């Protein structure tokens, strides 16, 4: 049959020591009785076990010559067995409820009480304990400092890569690191399956821990055990016990991949109260049990010894960063007080965005004005106005406009970078099209990537084909995308600011009529944009000397040099942009006459647009609307709930500087 071997492990002493630790442990009295008391009162829903406590308790009790072995080593060597040992120990030592219970809501206990009042009245079945259980058991990996406290090498942790996990780590508790990519939905999982017996005594129960399940045919009821059939047993949904189930996969980081290789993946199962504690697209430190999975589910009758493997989550450290939606705290309140004391801020903010790129102060000022946004939240009688600003940047190759765009995307949490094709699922199609394994055809229809309150950044604006051009023309002036293919009309409400960089097809500015260079795009699309910048490269000594000196000093220090002088920090801008957006100044009427006469002078310029050679000074009401929006944004960036004539003057100066680059 099966030969037997001898191992130094025996579970009797392990269970006795586990019980002694659970009862006697002092960290309020004992902590492990406080958790059990809260569980008894139906307050706590899950139990977390710290291995550091076990280690230090054993170490401090070793001073007396009674302890003989260690438990954490066996925990690391095998984990699943100790789970049922711990649940048995908890079930044996569950104190009574010290608090009142709303007993009528527990329909499971009510049904069980009805069954007991049926059976025990006659003078009954011993139900499995897990059906009665309500809590969840979780483990926590130890900390390195606790290991450093003592001589022993009780380390664990050590977040190995996906490919560093070998076949000798099955059954152990290991910690991994990587980026989460795919997260499935939440679906119930069966733990104990109950059948009703058609009013024939006790109702048979069954528990299946496998990933497959088979039903019963006949039942042990006495009148059903009688030589003729009495009712067909049926599964009962109410009496059964279920559990939340979720699955996800994790990928290796690009830093840990050896050269000339393709990153590998890993499947993770999660159950219990920890479900939905992680989201796609974050760096995590997951600790769990590395378990094998049978191949028989595929049913191929091949790979006689080859098996699939997966990790069952036990503890997740979300890590990464937190946006927090600028939730107000005392420290950030003193931070904004410091900003108030700082005086004028926007010039320092412009100086502090991209010090690696030299000069171009006005472009950075326009970026600041883009970040805050213009006038929004509609007007009377339902007319639509958007706070989003659309700015297109023109310049020759090699002006670090792409690097500036990357810096803006870094500093803006809503920024997204796209380009003409290269990746197909970024425009006119949903990211979940044909995605599920069932091929359920999940789709919204006509939508873009996070176009709701997003900052879309595009390089090579002339490159995109007709489809992406149609999409960018459709997202004009907060207009929703209503492209339909199969009766779907779930339109994405696009309210986004468009920032794009492009170049003429010649690759260099031309002495001829500047509109002949334009964008090589339709003039209707050009007129939509709020602000147009042209960055023309003029060879000169007194500026290229500074640029070369800056670049070489950056290269020499291998860092951002101290030659930069910025009192404000990128996280500080991240805080202050939300703070100033929250303030939200509104419009003051006293500037109406001034803006009207400014528009009159703008049309006076339109009376000289036929003078040519910089004919961009054309007549458009969107110019006035953008002037209003830019003045509103100038009020919003620093000022309180008031719009100043100085904002109108600054917007006018910005427009004149925008036009002045034509020459």
């Amino acid at each position: 049959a099966l030969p037997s071997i001898q191992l130094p492990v025996d579970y009797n002493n392990l269970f006795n020591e586990i019980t002694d630790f659970l009862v006697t442990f002092k960290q309020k009295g004992p902590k492990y009785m406080a958790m059990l008391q809260k569980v008894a009162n139906r307050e706590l829903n899950s139990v977390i076990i710290d291995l550091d406590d076990i280690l230090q308790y054993q170490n401090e009790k070793f001073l007396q010559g009674t302890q003989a072995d260690d438990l954490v080593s066996a925990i690391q060597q095998n984990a699943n067995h100790f789970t049922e040992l711990f649940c048995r120990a908890i079930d044996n030592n569950m104190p009574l409820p010290t608090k009142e219970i709303d007993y009528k809501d527990d329909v499971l206990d009510v049904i069980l009480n009805q069954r007991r009042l049926r059976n025990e009245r006659m003078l009954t079945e011993l139900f499995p304990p897990n059906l009665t259980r309500r809590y969840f058991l979780y483990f926590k990996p130890l900390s390195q400092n606790c290991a450093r406290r003592y001589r022993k090498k009780a380390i664990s942790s050590k977040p190995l890569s996906v490919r560093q996990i070998k076949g000798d780590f099955l059954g152990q508790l290991i910690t991994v690191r990587g980026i989460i990519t795919r997260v499935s939905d939440v679906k119930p999982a069966v733990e104990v399956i109950a059948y009703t017996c058609d009013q024939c005594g006790y109702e048979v129960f069954q528990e299946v821990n496998s990933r497959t399940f088979t039903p019963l045919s006949e039942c042990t009821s006495e009148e059903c055990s009688q030589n003729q059939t009495k009712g067909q047993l049926f599964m009962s949904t109410r009496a059964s016990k279920f559990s939340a189930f979720q699955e996800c996969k994790i990928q290796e980081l690009s830093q840990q991949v050896p050269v000339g290789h393709i990153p590998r993946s890993l499947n993770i199962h999660v159950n219990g109260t920890l479900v939905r504690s992680l989201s796609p697209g974050d760096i995590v430190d997951v600790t769990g049990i590395f378990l094998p999975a049978p191949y028989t589910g595929f049913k191929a009758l091949k790979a006689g010894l080859l098996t699939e493997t997966y990790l069952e989550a036990q503890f997740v450290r979300q890590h990464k960063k937190k946006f927090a939606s600028f939730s107000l705290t005392s420290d950030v309140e003193e931070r904004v007080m410091e900003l108030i004391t700082s005086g004028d801020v926007y010039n320092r903010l412009a100086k502090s965005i991209a010090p690696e790129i030299y000069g171009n102060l006005d472009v950075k000022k326009a970026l600041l004005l883009l970040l805050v946004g213009g006038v929004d939240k509609r007007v009377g009688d339902g007319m639509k106005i958007r706070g989003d600003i659309n700015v297109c940047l023109m310049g020759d190759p090699g002006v670090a406009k792409s690097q500036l765009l990357k810096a803006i995307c870094k500093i803006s949490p809503r920024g997204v970078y796209t380009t003409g094709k290269g990746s197909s699922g970024v425009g006119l199609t949903a990211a979940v099209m044909k995605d599920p394994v069932t091929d359920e055809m999940i789709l919204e229809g006509g939508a873009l990537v996070l176009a709701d309150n997003g900052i879309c950044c595009i390089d090579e604006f002339d490159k995109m084909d007709e489809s992406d051009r149609t999409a960018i023309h459709e997202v004009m002036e907060q207009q929703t995308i209503s492209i339909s293919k199969a009766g779907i009309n779930t339109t994405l409400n696009a309210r986004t600011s468009i920032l794009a960089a492009a170049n003429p097809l010649y690759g260099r500015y031309n002495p001829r009529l500047s509109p002949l260079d334009n964008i090589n795009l339709p003039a209707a699309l050009l007129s939509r944009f709020d602000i147009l910048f042209l960055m023309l490269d003029i060879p000169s000594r007194d500026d290229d000397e500074k640029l070369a000196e800056h670049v070489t000093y950056v290269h020499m220090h291998n860092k951002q040099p101290d030659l930069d002088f910025t009192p404000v920090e990128p996280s500080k801008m991240r805080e202050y942009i939300a703070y100033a957006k929250t303030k939200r100044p509104v419009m003051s009427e006293a500037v109406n006459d001034y803006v009207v006469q400014a528009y009159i002078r703008l049309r006076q310029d339109s009376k000289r647009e036929m003078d040519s050679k910089f004919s961009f000074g054309q007549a458009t009401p969107r110019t006035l609307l953008g002037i209003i929006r830019l003045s509103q944004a100038l009020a919003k960036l620093r000022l309180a709930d008031m719009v100043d004539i100085d904002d109108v003057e600054e917007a006018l100066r910005l427009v004149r500087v925008s036009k002045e680059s034509l020459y």
Partner: protein, 420 residues
């Protein structure tokens, strides 16, 4: 006094009484039995209140509870909420044809041609192993009749969550629906509705060959109530006014400054002329087609958007427009689909960006206006479709401005016959 059998029931009024809230809690936990006993109570209420008893015996009675619990979202559905009444909002994605559901099985003893009716329970049929007529008593003489049974009309609806529940660019999730009887075809594609019903979980068959079952269960909901999201004297009083023409013309565009004559023209086009189909001469066109031209500093798209929603029927498109045989996505069949121009029969079809119309589609327009009847001959299908639609189109000139010296034809870039 009406003969209708339908009772609406709100929970808050049901909550207003102290003895009823206990029944409220009991209904939350056990909906089916409470609803059945309530229906029996209402059935007895007929005789209890009439004291014709002939119309009562034929009709059944049902309730439509609503506003029981707060509207929840598909992103938070714990297993603790199984077989409990919940309230859900969403948008309908797709429907399905009516699915028959067996209720009464029909069997026949083919040897003696004896028939009997067998009731069922939980779908499973307990087949009778021997005919009740002991005069023959043959065991193997039964063979059912498929077309002499009784059936119920079940239908499955696919629903998606509202976009309001997705704050950070995530994807929507879909929940299946089940309906019976009066709720069949109560919604169609694109509807915004709110539903109240209980939760259900079912084991999946996996391999149909074997009795093995998966460790995961499919989730779906069953609902009982669904909600969505003599004035002629008032006409002649208005219609008798003298200056109704000007106010009516100016009312359709409150934000548009001046441009009175074009507003009058658009309003008159919306009013439309007469249509006649005298036999010996043929039909005459009754539709009115108007073009707008000018630089993109006019807000001329706003007029199109106004008139698209003001008119009863009208499709707003851009510069496909007619019928084409399509290949169905979810189901593997071939279905003929009509175009936007066909869908605007009797209304006004709004076209934007007329210049960028390509070339193949323009000829289509050339046959939809001079004849108002489109024919398609593809994949063995030859037929003609009626259009009878009005056209309101806008176009832009070539260049930053429309030079007055140059005539219209060059700037608009349209064929002279189509413009004429």
């Amino acid at each position: 006094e009406l003969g209708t059998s339908n009772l609406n029931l709100d929970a808050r009024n049901l909550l207003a009484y102290k003895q009823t809230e206990d029944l409220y809690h009991q209904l939350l936990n056990y909906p089916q039995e409470v609803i059945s006993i309530m229906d029996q109570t209402i059935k007895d209420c007929m005789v209890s209140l009439i004291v014709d008893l002939d119309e009562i015996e034929t009709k059944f009675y049902k309730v439509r509870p609503y506003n029981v619990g707060s509207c929840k979202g598909m992103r938070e559905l714990n297993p603790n909420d199984i077989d409990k009444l919940i309230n859900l909002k969403g948008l309908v994605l797709r429907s399905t044809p009516v699915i028959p559901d067996m209720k009464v099985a029909f069997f026949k003893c083919n040897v003696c041609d004896h028939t009997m009716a067998v009731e069922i329970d939980r779908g499973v049929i307990q087949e009778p192993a021997r005919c009740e007529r002991i005069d023959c008593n043959e065991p193997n003489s039964m063979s059912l009749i498929h077309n002499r049974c009784s059936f119920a009309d079940k239908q499955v609806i696919k629903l998606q969550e509202t976009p309001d529940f997705v704050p950070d660019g995530q994807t929507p999730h879909s929940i299946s629906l089940c309906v019976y009887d009066e709720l069949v075809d109560s919604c169609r594609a694109g509807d915004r509705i709110e539903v109240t019903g209980t939760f259900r979980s079912i084991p999946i068959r996996a391999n149909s060959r074997q009795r093995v079952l998966k460790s995961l269960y499919k989730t779906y909901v069953d609902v009982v109530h669904v909600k969505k999201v003599q004035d002629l004297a008032k006409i002649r009083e208005v219609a008798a006014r003298e200056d109704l023409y000007s106010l009516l013309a100016r009312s359709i565009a409150p934000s548009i400054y001046e441009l009175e004559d074009v507003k009058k023209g658009i309003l008159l086009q919306l009013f439309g002329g007469t249509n006649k189909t005298f036999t010996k001469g043929g039909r005459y066109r009754g539709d009115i087609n108007i073009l707008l031209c000018g630089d993109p500093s006019t807000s001329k798209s706003q007029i199109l958007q106004y008139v698209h929603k003001i008119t009863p029927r009208g499709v707003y498109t851009s510069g496909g427009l007619t019928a084409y045989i399509t290949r169905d996505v979810d189901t593997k069949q071939l279905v003929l689909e009509s175009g936007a121009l066909v869908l605007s029969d009797g209304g006004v079809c709004c076209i934007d960006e007329f210049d960028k119309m390509s070339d193949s589609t323009r000829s289509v327009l050339h046959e939809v206006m001079e004849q108002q009847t489109i024919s398609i001959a593809k994949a063995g299908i030859i037929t003609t479709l009626n259009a009878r639609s009005s056209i309101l189109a806008s176009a832009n000139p070539i260049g930053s401005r429309y030079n007055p010296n140059l005539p219209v034809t060059e700037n608009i870039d349209l064929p002279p016959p189509l413009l004429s």
